[PDB]
């Protein structure tokens, strides 16, 4: 009775969604921008080299003023650097060594740490008594934390490996919205430059798009052969890019619901540990397992500049707010700055 | 600093002193001995941690014979294992705890697939993975008393329809031990220990101590030729 009608309605809706997805993809990006002149070679080179880490680097994040950095490693350290003079600004000890993500508030006041202990800890910088102390320990998840980002000084987004996502308020400590609907473990989420939307990828060859105040999931995204490790977000808010573990990076649209572009080369048979964009959106920056980062033309996917210089796997990379530099953090303990 | 402002000198001083502290901390954080613990549920991991006196990951620490031992118990997690184990490739040893008594009990709808099938599948998955082709494996065998008191009244072929031996304890114990130690695919690099637990076995961690000593000598006696 009710069950049969529900199954029939679900099948009909799935067929309609598949038909819409098939019809929407009239042409690909590579077929439209054949008249755009190539960027040529980009012989980027090292300007600084930060030292002092001992085990691998898991996460790095920029600041809003394009000058300071933060990075987290196995040893138990979260370190805030001054890029111009290659100096320490802050050093932060931890209690859980198995960190996987970093956050740095757009007001220069708070940072965040998270990983393999289910708790997202939030740290206050601009103190009075002279030490970056601990304020809040957000709990409520049952699996390892993948990534966390700040909305403002009193709103945060977290995701773990339980198929769930959380919108949280620092002041009270109580979760405000739970997002469910994933099958596999969730690996990452990116924000939007209006704090109203966000997108996540899960270890089930899918990525979904969610509204931030309603609590619902408005879109679902398929097309990969294995799990997605890293995802980031296009600055204008009408596309995003994901990185799988089957040697292919993808560019989707948050408004067309279809696989749009793919990046992969035959000589590359390894994974994509991190993907980032740049300020103008004309470069895609990818960290691989072949020990070197590639720089794809993020709009034609027909070429790649190359950045080498690491003795191990690349795990994270970032780009300044103003576009001045790009930073790579890898498994050899060294963090490097290109301009 | 003739070309430095009056205030960047203190900045350089701060950065240098933080580098000193990092270096000292990361030098003192390479002298404690790592260990990674594993075992199927209800297989005696609680007994192992209780006898030797030591959610997400649960870490635990103890001090013996002037060495600080650090055991990572990771059984509280139920997520996929492809993701949180490659951060464990620097450990000396993998402790693997199982029990000999559960040779009959069925954990699912398939009566042939008892608990030992799952334990040996986990063992084979761990031994033949990429991030542990140089890692010693310590196999703790538990529950001997109930095993004898069961096989006095029940056969063994219920889970081994190829066994042709005596139905006393010793032959069963030898057969189980060889059945565990014969799945290794490269005996030129790895090694597989075994020790039989008992409720008064105050030597429960002495076995681990000896295994780690031998692993370290194997490393130091290979990196210098010989």
């Amino acid at each position, epitope marked *: 009775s009710e069950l049969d009608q529900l199954r029939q309605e679900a099948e009909q809706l799935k067929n309609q969604i598949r038909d819409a997805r098939k019809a929407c993809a009239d042409a690909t990006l590579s077929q439209i921008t054949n008249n755009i002149d190539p960027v040529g070679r980009i012989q980027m080179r090292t300007r600084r080299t930060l030292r002092g880490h001992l085990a691998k680097i898991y996460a790095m994040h920029w600041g809003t003023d394009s*000058r*300071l950095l933060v990075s987290a490693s196995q040893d138990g350290k979260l370190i805030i650097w*001054d890029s111009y003079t290659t*100096n*320490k*600004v*802050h050093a932060i000890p931890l209690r859980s060594s198995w960190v996987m993500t970093c956050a740095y508030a757009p007001s*220069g006041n708070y940072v965040a740490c998270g990983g393999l202990d289910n708790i997202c800890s939030i740290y206050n910088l601009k103190t*009075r*008594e*002279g*030490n970056v102390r601990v304020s809040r320990e957000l709990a409520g998840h049952t699996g390892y934390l993948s990534c966390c980002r700040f909305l403002d000084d009193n709103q945060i987004v977290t995701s773990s490996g339980d198929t769930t996502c959380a919108l949280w308020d620092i002041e009270t400590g109580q979760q405000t919205t739970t997002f469910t609907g994933h099958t596999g473990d969730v690996m990452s989420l990116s924000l939007a430059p209006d704090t109203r939307l966000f997108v996540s990828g899960a270890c089930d060859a899918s990525a979904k798009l969610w509204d931030v105040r309603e609590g619902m999931c408005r879109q679902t995204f398929t097309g990969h052969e294995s799990d997605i490790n890293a995802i980031c977000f296009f600055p204008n808010g009408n596309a995003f890019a994901t990185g799988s573990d089957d040697a292919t990076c993808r560019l989707f649209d948050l408004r067309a619901d279809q696989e749009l572009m793919t990046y992969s080369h035959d000589n590359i048979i390894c994974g994509i540990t991190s993907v980032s964009f740049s300020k103008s959106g004309r470069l895609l920056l990818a960290g691989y397992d072949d020990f070197n980062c590639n720089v794809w033309d993020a709009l034609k996917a027909d070429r790649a500049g190359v950045l080498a210089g690491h003795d191990n796997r690349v795990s994270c990379l970032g780009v300044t707010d103003d576009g001045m530099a790009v930073a790579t953090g890898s498994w050899d303990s060294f963090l490097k700055i290109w301009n | 600093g003739c070309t430095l*402002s*009056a*205030e*960047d*000198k*203190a*900045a350089v*001083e*701060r950065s240098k*002193m933080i580098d000193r502290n990092l270096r000292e901390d990361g030098e003192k954080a390479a002298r404690e001995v790592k260990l990674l613990l594993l075992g199927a549920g209800e297989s005696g991991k609680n007994t192992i941690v209780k006898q030797m006196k030591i959610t997400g990951i649960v870490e635990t620490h103890f001090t013996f014979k002037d060495l600080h031992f650090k055991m990572f118990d990771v059984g509280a997690q139920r997520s996929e294992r492809k993701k949180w184990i490659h951060c464990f490739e620097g450990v000396t040893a993998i402790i693997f705890c199982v029990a000999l008594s559960d040779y009959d009990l069925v954990l699912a709808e398939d009566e042939e697939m008892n608990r030992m099938h799952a334990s040996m599948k986990l063992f084979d998955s761990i031994c033949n993975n990429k991030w542990f082709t140089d890692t010693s494996i310590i196999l703790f065998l538990n529950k001997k008393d109930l095993f004898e008191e069961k096989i006095k009244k029940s056969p063994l072929t219920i889970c081994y329809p190829e066994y042709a031996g005596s139905n006393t304890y010793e032959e069963a114990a030898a057969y189980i031990q060889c059945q565990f130690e014969d799945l290794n695919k490269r005996k030129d690099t790895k090694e597989i220990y075994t020790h039989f637990t008992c409720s008064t076995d105050t030597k429960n961690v002495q076995f681990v101590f000896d295994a780690v000593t031998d692993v370290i000598i194997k490393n130091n006696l290979k990196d210098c030729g010989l």
Partner: single-chain antibody
Amino acid sequence: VQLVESGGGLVQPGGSRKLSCSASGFAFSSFGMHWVRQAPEKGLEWVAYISSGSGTIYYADTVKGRFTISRDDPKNTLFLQMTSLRSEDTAMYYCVRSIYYYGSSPFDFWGQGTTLTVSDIVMTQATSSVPVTPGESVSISCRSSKSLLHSNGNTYLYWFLQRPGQSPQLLIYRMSNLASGVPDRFSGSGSGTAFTLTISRLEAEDVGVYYCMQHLEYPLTFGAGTKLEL
């Protein structure tokens, strides 16, 4: 955050005495420390500076061989030691903290000071007294004998206030920024050797003495300070 100073008094020329500063409420060992002094009837003048790790020490010109600064970290304490005094050395002393890293705001918090009695680039302050009224806008200005704009964009000028019976309190660091606990009516700006501070909508407990200071290169030099009286 509390900085309590002790050890002052009245001594005859010569002799020796040690002025101590006890800190409570903050991480002692991440801040560098300064000692400053004020004349019984006139302005301020830098004295000494000690830094983190006991690495660097700077004195002024009229002080060497006589003064010794040190810090004792475990008890969170700072020491100045003084010997062979003269009648020119009667003043009152303040212990100031400052932490140098990018974005910081040095000279943030000042102590109460202690009275001691005994039986180059210079700052020119435009005026000695200017009358005021509660409700009009006011400006003050001073000038420096050499340019203070370094090569990195910094413009090292510090603006301080002192109300009657009180201790100094920061108002402006690096020519454009507000310290902690100060209303947003205060403002300031500058140019090539001519520096201005602006107060709008005057009030009570806003009358007293104003000072300007440089920190481009040691030794540090004050000026004579102007007065708004009402």
